[PDB]
Amino acid sequence: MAALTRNPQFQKLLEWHRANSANLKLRELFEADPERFNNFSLNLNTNHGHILVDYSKNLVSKEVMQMLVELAKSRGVEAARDNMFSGSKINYTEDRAVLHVALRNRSNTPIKVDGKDVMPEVNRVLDKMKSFCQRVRSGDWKGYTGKSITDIINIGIGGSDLGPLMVTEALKPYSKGGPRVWFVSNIDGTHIAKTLASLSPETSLFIIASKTFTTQETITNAETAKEWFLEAAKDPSAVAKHFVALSTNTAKVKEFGIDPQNMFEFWDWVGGRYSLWSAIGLSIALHVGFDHFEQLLSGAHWMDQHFLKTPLEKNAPVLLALLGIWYINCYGCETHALLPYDQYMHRFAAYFQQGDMESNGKYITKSGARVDHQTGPIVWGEPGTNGQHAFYQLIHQGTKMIPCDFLIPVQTQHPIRKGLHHKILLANFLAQTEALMKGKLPEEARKELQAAGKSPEDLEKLLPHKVFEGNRPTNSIVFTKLTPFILGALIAMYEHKIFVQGIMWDINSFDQWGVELGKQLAKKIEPELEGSSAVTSHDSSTNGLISFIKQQRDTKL
Amino acid sequence: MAALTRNPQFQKLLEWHRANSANLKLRELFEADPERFNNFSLNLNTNHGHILVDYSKNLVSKEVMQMLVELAKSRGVEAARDNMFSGSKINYTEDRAVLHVALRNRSNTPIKVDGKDVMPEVNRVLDKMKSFCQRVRSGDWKGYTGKSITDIINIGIGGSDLGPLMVTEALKPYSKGGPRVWFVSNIDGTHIAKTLASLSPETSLFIIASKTFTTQETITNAETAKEWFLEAAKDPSAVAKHFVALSTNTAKVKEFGIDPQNMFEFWDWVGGRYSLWSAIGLSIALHVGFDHFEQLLSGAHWMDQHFLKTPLEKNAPVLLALLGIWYINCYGCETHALLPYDQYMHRFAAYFQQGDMESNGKYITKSGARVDHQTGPIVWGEPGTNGQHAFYQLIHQGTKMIPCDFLIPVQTQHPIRKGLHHKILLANFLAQTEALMKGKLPEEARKELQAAGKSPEDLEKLLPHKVFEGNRPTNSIVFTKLTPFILGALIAMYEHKIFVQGIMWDINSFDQWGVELGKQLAKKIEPELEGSSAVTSHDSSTNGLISFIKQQRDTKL
Numbered sequence A, B: 001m002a003a004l005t006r007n008p009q010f011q012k013l014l015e016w017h018r019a020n021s022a023n024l025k026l027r028e029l030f031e032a033d034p035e036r037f038n039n040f041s042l043n044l045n046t047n048h049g050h051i052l053v054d055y056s057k058n059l060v061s062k063e064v065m066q067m068l069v070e071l072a073k074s075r076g077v078e079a080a081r082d083n084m085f086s087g088s089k090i091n092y093t094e095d096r097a098v099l100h101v102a103l104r105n106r107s108n109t110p111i112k113v114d115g116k117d118v119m120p121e122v123n124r125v126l127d128k129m130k131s132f133c134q135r136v137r138s139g140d141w142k143g144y145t146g147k148s149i150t151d152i153i154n155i156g157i158g159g160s161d162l163g164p165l166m167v168t169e170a171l172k173p174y175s176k177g178g179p180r181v182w183f184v185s186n187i188d189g190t191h192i193a194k195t196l197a198s199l200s201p202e203t204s205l206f207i208i209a210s211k212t213f214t215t216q217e218t219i220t221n222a223e224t225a226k227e228w229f230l231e232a233a234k235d236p237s238a239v240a241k242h243f244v245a246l247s248t249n250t251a252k253v254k255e256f257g258i259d260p261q262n263m264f265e266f267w268d269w270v271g272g273r274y275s276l277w278s279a280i281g282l283s284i285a286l287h288v289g290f291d292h293f294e295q296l297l298s299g300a301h302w303m304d305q306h307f308l309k310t311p312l313e314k315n316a317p318v319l320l321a322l323l324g325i326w327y328i329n330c331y332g333c334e335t336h337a338l339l340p341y342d343q344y345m346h347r348f349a350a351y352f353q354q355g356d357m358e359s360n361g362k363y364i365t366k367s368g369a370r371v372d373h374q375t376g377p378i379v380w381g382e383p384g385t386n387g388q389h390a391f392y393q394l395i396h397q398g399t400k401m402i403p404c405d406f407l408i409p410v411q412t413q414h415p416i417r418k419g420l421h422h423k424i425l426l427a428n429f430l431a432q433t434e435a436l437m438k439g440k441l442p443e444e445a446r447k448e449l450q451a452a453g454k455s456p457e458d459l460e461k462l463l464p465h466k467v468f469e470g471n472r473p474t475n476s477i478v479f480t481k482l483t484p485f486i487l488g489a490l491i492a493m494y495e496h497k498i499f500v501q502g503i504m505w506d507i508n509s510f511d512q513w514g515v516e517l518g519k520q521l522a523k524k525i526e527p528e529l530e531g532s533s534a535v536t537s538h539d540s541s542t543n544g545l546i547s548f549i550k551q552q553r554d555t556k557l
């Protein structure tokens, strides 16, 4: 088997689930224990707002939580965490440290990789970012015709795109005095084309974001941007005023036409999906200002310290991790829904699709043995209240068990109409988890049908359709306000949740070998699409699709 | 039990799956039979472009497909379809017809509800839409200060939002000479606030989209918009120049204060999640023009006729539906991924999240029995290639089986760099499904690592992580170009897929009693948030969360 399934605390947990889980009913759990919310929630005081992690509406008893905490301990979570924080090369398949926590290490306590403290270089690049932010935001940095920059365009994909996009979206109210920010990511030429259409070469600065600086998508997009720019500027020396790089490839960066002084470096121990805290977050810092960027880092640092110092039984990311293990490995739930009741957070779910799924969508353990159990879930969601009208039908009355995290700020950035909108938003946030837990009993629906004037025949027919089984578990995560600091803490919380789950599964949360095959096969297909000659080199489906493409590409509609 | 599980053809199918499914290997199926693509694909000629539905990379044989078609006949799919198209009241819980097909019935063949042809009223509303679009788009329609309209704002949620949003996004290239379009949907005050900040009351036209015209989010947003408007206009008669309604509720529209001639009617047999084809599509028609809206309707009509007249074994929506049944009810896959290789299609997956999940996230059958089998899947996805750099890691190397539909137009709307971007996009589209099918055997990975120069030690350490198990089934849906017509055909195709699955599960695809409950939920909590007094009326979690909101709402950050 694998490490997890061979673990006696896991075996005990699974056996307990088999014997007892049918006895777990949320309604009864709350009725039996008025201290339930008190015992199954964490009210975190960060000194910059509170984060309440309410996990009480979960299918767990005190005994289940105890078993889960014991499993985290017996899977080596505490030791593994310490190894991450100390710079051990815990990314074992690539032999790399995993040090996104160093990027936001505000305390400046030394963190060594190969005997050398990484903090000086972290802080050097942060200083460079700050200076660049002053130059651009003040208008001192001029374009090729001597005008201030009005638009920043990040070009990047995956980890070089999602974090900066999600965070600038989430922190939009903090962007007064900042340039507009645009994100180009898809190779689909629609993306860059529609972006450039609304821009002036005179006042636009491009940020080329690539860990490797070889990703075909990003480099192609970057070269398209440069071609468009040079059409107007007609001077290759002007490129240095309008293009900067987030990478380490000094030669290719210089060859591109970017001043080596405008390469913002990061390191191999910064995973792409953990990179917004590094140089990769330059578009964030430009948009909301460096002070706000530091606040974002400080919130993450607070959560790092919470994760590092707190006993597991009261440790927020650990508890979130453990509830997920319970639903994944015991109940067999494929998915995890992230439902922020916040329009600014509209890209939060998409961000953690990479963060979670690229981390823990794995099947090989540290020993090299295949897992014989589930790993990472499929992450999904849209902001409330919209989902209530879209897919909550299935959550309430479908045939899937779907753990959901509901998230909301107490204070809105836009308290319009004396707080009316936010009052309604909050009421929906609360009522939905309440309804998911409670459902609606036959006796309740029956009386409603009788009051509505339904005939005995119609009532009988309609009744089962109007009943809600309930017993659908949720987390409610509520926080004072979505400030840069609080957002930083929340992202870090999920980062550490993902880490804990990965350790427990005995997988590598920090590599991504699964992207290689698709890349290989695409490089082979690319040149074959040119010209009218038949392609016969693949399976008949791939060949047939290529044939269709060749046949249909000249058709006038 | 339930109709599906009681069905002998289903039990036959499932027994076959038990005994034989482990012997289906895609790589081997393709090697053994060069005709596989030909035997498991449909090349549809619409006379306005081709749609290739290539289902050959699925874990199916001739025998499997035979059994699935036989099950569809046994479950009465054809009869149910005919009943929908004839105006039978197949939404049995609400006693309503289900006639989105009437909305786009270009033939004008009578479709009767209660002995009355619905087509005259369908066409009367379409003619009203056409006339209105001409007046606004031409600049003839003037605001309260005598200026042409520059911005249109749709206010609606769920079915009154997602269709118009998705389609205007997908058909963006067709919007030259149309007003800018905005979508406000969330009750979250951020949504309306940030929209209004960018608008002038003098040149903005609001479209209040709501079937019932009582939905809290929509009516509140509408009232906020009206208050903002009237603060500038200071004249109730000016509202008629700036507010129109799309609804079935004449009285509530009048009550809100909208001109009777400013109401675009639809009917109870138009489901919200099937409503973009009706008056609800006004924002589409305003943005891209009525002619393009008519093309969209015409594409849907073509697909309707395909569904109606084609033998099950060559019927595109039927086959997609049956492959879904196979993966859901035999393999137990919770989810279905929609992955369009098209940035304009970036809201397509979210749209069918509603269309699918709100339709088929059900657990009561026509007979009143609780299902003892799975119903609708969780639908999710992001456009390619971004997905590859977000979550494809899990699709390739996770522990979940995930049926994926890959979609792409052959012709791009933006053939920049002499088609270089689209070449790369197509290459990735093709390679990914090839990769998911083929995988990479241990011996194949071994040879690659050996050629890379890895020592016996390093090779052995890395090997298992580099293996791709493959056998991951996909659909590839390729179409000449994403025109209004082709988009219409594609949406209708999935609508009918959803219909077929619903009939086979014996559920009502057309009600939403879970959604209706939602609209009854927040009302009790709303007044309890006002004031400083402690709430003790609910379970301790709801109480505790309310206490947190009250404690945290005055804190200064």
Ligand SMILES: O=P(O)(O)OC[C@@H](O)[C@@H](O)[C@H](O)CO
Pocket (backbone or CB within 6 Å): A157, A158, A159, A160, A209, A210, A211, A212, A213, A214, A215, A218, A271, A272, A273, A358, A512, B389, B390
């Ligand atoms: O930052 P570069 O090297 O372009 O790579 C982009 C993505 O492929 C990368 O983030 C990947 O998803 C791993 O996190």
Ligand SMILES: O=P(O)(O)OC[C@@H](O)[C@@H](O)[C@H](O)CO
Pocket (backbone or CB within 6 Å): A389, A390, B157, B158, B159, B160, B209, B210, B211, B212, B213, B214, B215, B218, B271, B272, B273, B274, B358, B512, B515
């Ligand atoms: O259109 P109204 O009645 O406002 O309803 C909004 C949504 O609840 C509705 O579209 C729902 O998504 C059902 O399809």
